[PDB]
Amino acid sequence: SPQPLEQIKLSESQLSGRVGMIEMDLASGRTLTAWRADERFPMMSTFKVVLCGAVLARVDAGDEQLERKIHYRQQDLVDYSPVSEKHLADGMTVGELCAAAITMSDNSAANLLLATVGGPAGLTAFLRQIGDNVTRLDRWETELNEALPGDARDTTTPASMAATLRKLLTSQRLSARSQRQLLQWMVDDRVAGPLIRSVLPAGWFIADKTGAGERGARGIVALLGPNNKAERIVVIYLRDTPASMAERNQQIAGIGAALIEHWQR
Ligand SMILES: OC[C@H]1O[C@H](O[C@H]2[C@H](O)[C@@H](O)[C@H](OCCCCCCC3CCCCC3)O[C@@H]2CO)[C@H](O)[C@@H](O)[C@@H]1O
Ligand SMILES: *C(=O)c1cc2ccccn2c1N[C@@H](C(=O)O)[C@](C)(COC(=O)Cc1ccc(O)c(O)c1)S(=O)O
């Protein structure tokens, strides 16, 4: 595989789309690779990690409990609710909803949690409170995945997302237990995680949240590193490409391969 930046360029050429990427040291925030890092990209499902960070902040403040059971109705469900559609009779705890949203990409679980933090406006205010003045959520699932060209709604930038993930996982803004919980939810991805692990060389740590949208939108926020350690945050977003989902997955994997083969930088 070629050098990271060269592979990223090759992906834009082959996809006819825009790629946004940041590779950052998790412990210190040192930026290693940055491509279109300040350009906007739809967050898609990756917003769910920030959402659960806002939920954990409420738990830390005593305004929420992960144990609290929420009962909802069938009319509250939106498209793709693999876990939440199974609990119309018994409900789900707040903690279970975050696990469903992050590890199973459950859209209704995400909307139920979004309401608890004040909706899109409330989550955006949370972002502003932790110092992210760029990322914004404006809609609910599943409209937030629309990815209209030039639409600033429901977007982030690679640099803003990486910094925000770092703040939530390591800056001590969240309690130790909350930081550990957010990390574990990413480690527990039941969809993309297992497949990625199957193709990663032995010894590489992976935790992640992936997302997809219209007009070729595709992305992943991940923790990756050799020696079975979460050494770096890697954020990759793709937008405005007419390519098949398989090809978008392949290009993202190719950028990861370039990072793995040229890790010491
Ligand atoms: O020299 C380094 C390695 O080169 C190959 O490994 C390949 C691997 O066989 C392939 O399956 C993977 O694809 C990349 C799989 C990455 C999938 C997701 C990437 C995501 C998640 C993490 C952040 C970026 C995006 O690339 C590596 C590097 O070439 C060899 O197979 C392996 O024995 C060797 O240790
Ligand atoms: C957010 O999670 C998301 C947003 C959208 C929008 C439209 C359709 C599907 N979306 C998802 N979820 C989806 C992705 O994030 O892509 C899930 C998590 C599935 O994914 C994968 O398909 C992961 C994957 C990648 C490559 C493969 O070869 C493979 O078998 C799986 S969800 O639909 O389960």
Coordinates of all heavy atoms in Angstrom, one line a residue, residues 219-254:
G219 N -18.7 6.7 6.5 CA -17.6 7.2 7.4 C -17.4 6.3 8.6 O -18.1 5.4 8.9
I220 N -16.3 6.6 9.3 CA -16.0 5.8 10.5 C -15.2 6.7 11.5 O -14.3 7.5 11.0 CB -15.1 4.5 10.2 CG1 -14.9 3.7 11.4 CG2 -13.8 4.9 9.5 CD1 -14.2 2.3 11.1
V221 N -15.5 6.5 12.8 CA -14.7 7.1 13.8 C -14.1 5.9 14.5 O -14.8 5.0 14.9 CB -15.5 8.1 14.8 CG1 -16.0 9.2 13.9 CG2 -16.6 7.3 15.4
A222 N -12.8 5.8 14.7 CA -12.2 4.6 15.3 C -11.0 4.9 16.2 O -10.4 6.0 16.1 CB -11.8 3.7 14.2
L223 N -10.7 3.9 17.0 CA -9.5 3.9 17.8 C -8.7 2.7 17.3 O -9.3 1.6 17.1 CB -9.8 3.7 19.3 CG -10.7 4.8 19.9 CD1 -10.9 4.5 21.4 CD2 -10.1 6.2 19.7
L224 N -7.5 2.9 17.0 CA -6.7 1.9 16.3 C -5.2 2.0 16.8 O -4.7 3.0 17.1 CB -6.7 2.2 14.8 CG -5.9 1.3 13.9 CD1 -6.6 -0.1 13.8 CD2 -5.8 2.0 12.5
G225 N -4.6 0.8 16.9 CA -3.2 0.8 17.3 C -2.6 -0.6 17.4 O -3.4 -1.6 17.6
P226 N -1.3 -0.7 17.2 CA -0.6 -2.0 17.3 C -0.4 -2.3 18.8 O -0.7 -1.5 19.7 CB 0.7 -1.7 16.6 CG 1.0 -0.3 16.9 CD -0.4 0.4 16.7
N227 N 0.2 -3.4 19.1 CA 0.5 -3.9 20.4 C -0.8 -3.9 21.3 O -0.7 -3.6 22.5 CB 1.6 -2.9 21.0 CG 2.9 -3.0 20.2 OD1 3.5 -4.1 20.0 ND2 3.3 -1.8 19.7
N228 N -1.9 -4.1 20.6 CA -3.2 -4.2 21.2 C -3.6 -3.0 22.1 O -4.3 -3.2 23.1 CB -3.3 -5.5 22.1 CG -3.6 -6.7 21.2 OD1 -4.7 -6.8 20.6 ND2 -2.7 -7.6 21.2
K229 N -3.2 -1.8 21.6 CA -3.4 -0.6 22.3 C -4.2 0.4 21.5 O -4.0 0.5 20.3 CB -2.1 0.0 22.8 CG -2.2 1.4 23.5 CD -0.9 1.8 24.0 CE -1.0 3.2 24.6 NZ -1.3 4.2 23.6
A230 N -5.1 1.2 22.1 CA -5.8 2.2 21.4 C -4.9 3.4 21.3 O -5.1 4.4 22.0 CB -7.1 2.6 22.2
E231 N -4.0 3.4 20.3 CA -3.0 4.5 20.2 C -3.5 5.7 19.5 O -3.2 6.9 19.9 CB -1.8 4.0 19.5 CG -0.6 4.9 19.6 CD 0.6 4.5 18.8 OE1 0.7 3.3 18.5 OE2 1.4 5.3 18.5
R232 N -4.3 5.5 18.4 CA -4.8 6.7 17.7 C -6.2 6.7 17.4 O -6.9 5.7 17.3 CB -4.0 6.8 16.3 CG -2.5 6.8 16.5 CD -1.7 7.2 15.3 NE -0.3 7.0 15.6 CZ 0.7 6.6 14.7 NH1 0.3 6.3 13.5 NH2 1.9 6.4 15.2
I233 N -6.7 7.9 17.3 CA -8.1 8.2 16.8 C -7.9 8.4 15.3 O -7.1 9.1 14.8 CB -8.6 9.5 17.4 CG1 -9.0 9.3 18.9 CG2 -9.9 9.9 16.6 CD1 -9.2 10.7 19.5
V234 N -8.8 7.7 14.5 CA -8.8 7.8 13.1 C -10.2 8.1 12.7 O -11.1 7.4 13.0 CB -8.3 6.5 12.4 CG1 -8.4 6.7 10.9 CG2 -6.9 6.2 12.8
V235 N -10.4 9.3 12.0 CA -11.7 9.7 11.5 C -11.6 9.8 10.0 O -10.8 10.5 9.5 CB -12.1 11.1 12.1 CG1 -13.4 11.6 11.5 CG2 -12.2 11.0 13.6
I236 N -12.5 9.1 9.3 CA -12.5 9.1 7.9 C -14.0 9.3 7.4 O -14.8 8.5 7.8 CB -12.0 7.9 7.2 CG1 -10.5 7.7 7.6 CG2 -12.1 7.9 5.7 CD1 -10.0 6.3 7.2
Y237 N -14.2 10.4 6.6 CA -15.6 10.6 6.1 C -15.4 10.7 4.5 O -14.4 11.1 4.0 CB -16.2 11.9 6.6 CG -16.6 11.9 8.0 CD1 -15.9 12.6 9.0 CD2 -17.7 11.1 8.4 CE1 -16.3 12.6 10.3 CE2 -18.1 11.1 9.7 CZ -17.4 11.9 10.7 OH -17.8 11.8 12.0
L238 N -16.5 10.2 3.8 CA -16.5 10.3 2.4 C -17.9 10.9 2.0 O -18.8 10.7 2.7 CB -16.6 8.9 1.8 CG -15.4 7.9 1.7 CD1 -14.7 7.8 3.1 CD2 -15.8 6.6 1.2
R239 N -17.9 11.7 1.0 CA -19.2 12.3 0.6 C -19.2 12.6 -0.9 O -18.1 12.7 -1.6 CB -19.5 13.6 1.3 CG -18.5 14.8 0.9 CD -18.9 16.0 1.7 NE -20.3 16.4 1.4 CZ -21.0 17.3 2.1 NH1 -20.6 17.8 3.2 NH2 -22.3 17.5 1.7
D240 N -20.4 12.7 -1.5 CA -20.6 13.0 -2.9 C -19.8 12.2 -3.9 O -19.1 12.6 -4.8 CB -20.3 14.5 -3.1 CG -21.2 15.4 -2.3 OD1 -22.4 15.3 -2.4 OD2 -20.6 16.2 -1.5
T241 N -20.0 10.9 -3.8 CA -19.5 9.9 -4.7 C -20.6 9.0 -5.2 O -21.5 8.7 -4.4 CB -18.4 9.0 -4.1 OG1 -18.2 7.9 -4.9 CG2 -18.8 8.5 -2.7
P242 N -20.7 8.6 -6.4 CA -21.8 7.8 -6.9 C -21.4 6.3 -6.7 O -22.1 5.4 -7.2 CB -21.9 8.1 -8.4 CG -20.5 8.3 -8.8 CD -20.0 9.1 -7.6
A243 N -20.3 6.0 -6.1 CA -19.9 4.6 -6.0 C -20.7 3.6 -5.1 O -21.4 4.0 -4.2 CB -18.4 4.6 -5.5
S244 N -20.6 2.4 -5.5 CA -21.3 1.3 -4.7 C -20.8 1.3 -3.3 O -19.6 1.8 -3.0 CB -20.9 -0.1 -5.3 OG -19.6 -0.4 -5.1
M245 N -21.6 0.8 -2.4 CA -21.2 0.7 -1.0 C -19.9 -0.1 -0.8 O -19.0 0.2 -0.1 CB -22.3 0.0 -0.2 CG -22.0 -0.2 1.3 SD -21.7 1.3 2.2 CE -23.3 1.8 2.5
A246 N -19.8 -1.2 -1.6 CA -18.6 -2.1 -1.5 C -17.4 -1.3 -1.9 O -16.3 -1.5 -1.2 CB -18.8 -3.3 -2.5
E247 N -17.4 -0.5 -2.9 CA -16.2 0.3 -3.3 C -15.9 1.4 -2.2 O -14.7 1.7 -2.0 CB -16.4 0.9 -4.7 CG -16.1 -0.2 -5.7 CD -16.6 0.1 -7.1 OE1 -17.8 -0.1 -7.3 OE2 -15.8 0.6 -7.9
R248 N -16.9 2.0 -1.6 CA -16.6 3.0 -0.6 C -16.0 2.2 0.6 O -15.1 2.7 1.2 CB -18.0 3.7 -0.2 CG -18.4 4.7 -1.2 CD -19.9 4.6 -1.5 NE -20.7 5.0 -0.4 CZ -22.0 4.6 -0.2 NH1 -22.6 3.9 -1.1 NH2 -22.7 5.1 0.8
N249 N -16.5 1.0 1.0 CA -15.9 0.3 2.1 C -14.5 -0.1 1.7 O -13.6 0.0 2.6 CB -16.7 -1.0 2.3 CG -18.0 -0.8 2.9 OD1 -18.3 0.2 3.5 ND2 -18.9 -1.8 2.8
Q250 N -14.2 -0.5 0.5 CA -12.9 -0.9 0.1 C -11.9 0.3 0.2 O -10.7 0.1 0.6 CB -12.9 -1.4 -1.3 CG -13.6 -2.8 -1.4 CD -14.0 -3.2 -2.8 OE1 -13.6 -2.6 -3.8 NE2 -14.8 -4.3 -2.8
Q251 N -12.3 1.5 -0.2 CA -11.4 2.6 -0.2 C -11.1 3.0 1.2 O -9.9 3.4 1.5 CB -12.1 3.8 -0.9 CG -12.2 3.6 -2.4 CD -10.9 3.4 -3.2 OE1 -9.9 3.9 -2.7 NE2 -10.9 2.7 -4.3
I252 N -12.1 3.0 2.1 CA -11.8 3.3 3.5 C -10.8 2.2 4.1 O -9.9 2.6 4.7 CB -13.1 3.3 4.3 CG1 -13.9 4.5 3.9 CG2 -12.8 3.5 5.8 CD1 -15.3 4.7 4.5
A253 N -11.1 1.0 3.8 CA -10.2 -0.1 4.2 C -8.8 0.2 3.7 O -7.8 -0.1 4.4 CB -10.7 -1.5 3.8
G254 N -8.7 0.6 2.4 CA -7.4 0.9 1.8 C -6.6 2.0 2.5 O -5.4 2.0 2.6

